[PDB]
């Protein structure tokens, strides 16, 4: 009766420094914001209900490392939605969204939707973080900038979150799913 839960395959890309893995573990295990336990294994899954629809969300933690440029797109096929993430406190990872990630994804999956995600939303106001960036003559990415970037790459949504405070996290995954439904 009612068949099987809709299985949604969601593939997460971004630089290693973005800390995208922390997002997936915190959400899947529904962890306290401060503490979550790492595992020695790569993929995370959650059974969740969005808009009254229950689904089996599979979160693929891809490797940012360049060594994997050949190996990583093997699992791209069959994806329902793409999560593209960059650190709000790393303009380099931001620039890589346009430079490498979007092109790669688009090359391999032209019509699969994309969600742009801004990580470390909590650091964007940390003084020590702001200072170190300035010394390097860099400033954190702003909301208006992330949005423009999304518009540019043709991402369904642009969203900012913080694995540590957990604020804005649930939404990323809810919206990832609204994108598939």
């Amino acid at each position: 009766f009612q068949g099987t839960m809709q299985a949604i395959k969601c593939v997460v890309v971004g630089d290693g420094a973005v800390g995208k893995t922390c997002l997936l573990i915190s959400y899947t295990t529904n962890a306290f914001p401060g503490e979550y336990i790492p595992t020695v294994f790569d993929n995370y899954s959650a059974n969740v209900m969005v808009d009254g629809k229950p689904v089996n969300l599979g979160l693929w933690d891809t490797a940012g490392q360049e060594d994997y440029d050949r190996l990583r797109p093997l699992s791209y096929p069959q994806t329902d939605v793409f999560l593209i993430c960059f650190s709000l406190v790393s303009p380099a990872s931001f620039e890589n969204v346009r430079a490498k990630w979007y092109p790669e994804v688009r090359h391999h999956c032209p019509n699969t939707p994309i969600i742009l995600v801004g990580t470390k939303l909590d650091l964007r106001d940390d003084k020590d973080t702001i200072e170190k960036l300035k010394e390097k003559k860099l400033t954190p990415i702003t909301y208006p900038q992330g949005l423009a970037m999304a518009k540019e790459i043709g991402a369904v949504k642009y969203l900012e979150c913080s694995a540590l405070t957990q604020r804005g996290l649930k939404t990323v995954f809810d919206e990832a799913i609204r994108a598939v439904l």
């Binding site: 529904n30 790569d42 899954s45």
Partner: protein, 410 residues
């Protein structure tokens, strides 16, 4: 109306203590009606059971007919609740009466069919695992029935902590949400304001003797892992020192807290007060072991779900296998090898020697399961992912290989 319910139960309890059967019954119903407003079927059903505890299968509407009408309604509730095993267990009592006490075979056949439906559902209708949330109320601002107390709450279907805590904060708007799961000091306990701790806790499978040594199917054992439970865990990771930028695992310890409620969940309420709390600490080694077991349990469970049904999407299988076969992002168990298999780690700890062998066994254990699952994946993988499957095999082969030598084939 948590307050009203708590109140009703407080009333209801007092009535039990002072034998006031008429009053007690009046309150059972008051309580039942409240659950129905909320659609808490299972808790509504358990509350009615308090009535039938007073009834007996006699002719003294007489007792047997009343107890009967009641069992029917309760069984109806559990069905909506999806506590099929609880429903079945009430069916059996009725069937005994029909079969051996009043020989009503027509009603009996009806009962048996109802049981056939519940047994079937258990196996074929998957029920979402509920979540448990601990809440601590630590301000002096709290009334005396909540003051400095911990309660475990049974989550509604697909209810997530973000949703729950929101309603909770709504209930108390001056309460501050604590940012630790750690047991609060007396400094906060004797404070004037309201402070609220809230986190998800893990249920512990209570031991049932029916399943004590027999081979029970996941399908019917898993249900007991998240229901009928009285004990719960929260695990937090604490780093001890000498952190390595290479493998955090070597230095990661877990503080684990245990909560025991006074009554099992589900019951007459969605929450019961924690009556005992304990903390135990687990070493990176012990942690690696749990981690390894979970991984193997999951792989085995998955290969079994797939050996059965073939209408199952493969995405969830690909994902699990690949993330264990080729853990690019996180370490892999190499991290565990690098961390505990040094000549040095063994020398420092001789106690762990029994454990190290156990850890080794899991790794050997992993490969068969992995290949077993890979066999399945091979047979049923869409052709656009064939290249993906082919790589996954190569790593596996590679992996099978390095492991077989180091650790004997299992």
């Amino acid at each position: 109306k948590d307050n009203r319910m708590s109140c009703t139960v407080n009333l209801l309890n007092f009535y039990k203590d002072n034998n006031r059967e008429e009053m007690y019954i009046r309150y059972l119903y008051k309580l039942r009606d409240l659950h129905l407003d909320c659609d808490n079927y299972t808790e509504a059903a358990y509350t009615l059971l308090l009535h039938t505890w007073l009834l007996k299968w006699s002719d003294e509407q007489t007792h047997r007919q009343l107890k009967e009408t009641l069992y029917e309604t309760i069984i109806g509730y559990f069905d909506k609740g999806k506590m099929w095993e609880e429903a079945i267990s009430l069916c059996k009592e009725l069937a005994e009466q029909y079969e051996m006490e009043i020989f009503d075979y027509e009603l009996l056949s009806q009962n048996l069919i109802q049981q056939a439906k519940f047994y079937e559902s258990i196996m074929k209708i998957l029920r979402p695992k509920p979540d448990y949330f601990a809440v601590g109320y630590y301000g002096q601002g709290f009334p005396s029935f909540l003051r400095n107390k911990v309660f475990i709450y049974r989550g509604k279907e697909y209810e997530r902590r973000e949703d729950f805590q929101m309603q909770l904060m709504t209930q108390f708007p001056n309460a501050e949400k604590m940012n630790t799961t750690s047991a609060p000091g007396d400094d906060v306990k004797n404070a004037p304001g309201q402070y609220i701790q809230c986190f998800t806790v893990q249920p512990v499978l209570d031991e049932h003797p029916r399943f004590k040594n027999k081979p029970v199917p996941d399908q019917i054992i898993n249900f007991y892992k998240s229901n009928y439970v009285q004990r719960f865990h929260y695990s937090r990771p604490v780093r001890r020192g000498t952190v390595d930028p290479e493998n955090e695992f070597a230095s990661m310890w877990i503080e684990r807290t245990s909560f025991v409620t006074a009554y099992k969940l589900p019951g007459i309420l969605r929450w019961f007060e924690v009556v005992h709390m304990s903390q135990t600490t687990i070493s990176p080694l012990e942690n690696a072991i749990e981690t390894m077991s979970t991984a193997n349990e999951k792989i085995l469970m998955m290969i079994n779900q797939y050996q059965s049904d073939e209408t199952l999407p493969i995405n969830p299988l690909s994902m699990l296998l690949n993330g264990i076969v080729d853990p690019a992002v996180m370490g892999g168990f190499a991290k565990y090898e690098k961390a505990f298999f040094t000549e040095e780690y063994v020398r420092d700890h001789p106690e762990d020697q029994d454990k190290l062998t156990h850890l080794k066994d899991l790794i050997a254990w992993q490969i068969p399961f992995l290949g077993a699952g890979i066999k399945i994946h091979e047979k049923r993988v869409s052709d656009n992912l064939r290249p993906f499957h082919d790589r996954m095999e190569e790593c596996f082969k590679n992996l099978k290989m390095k492991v077989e030598k180091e650790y004997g084939v299992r």
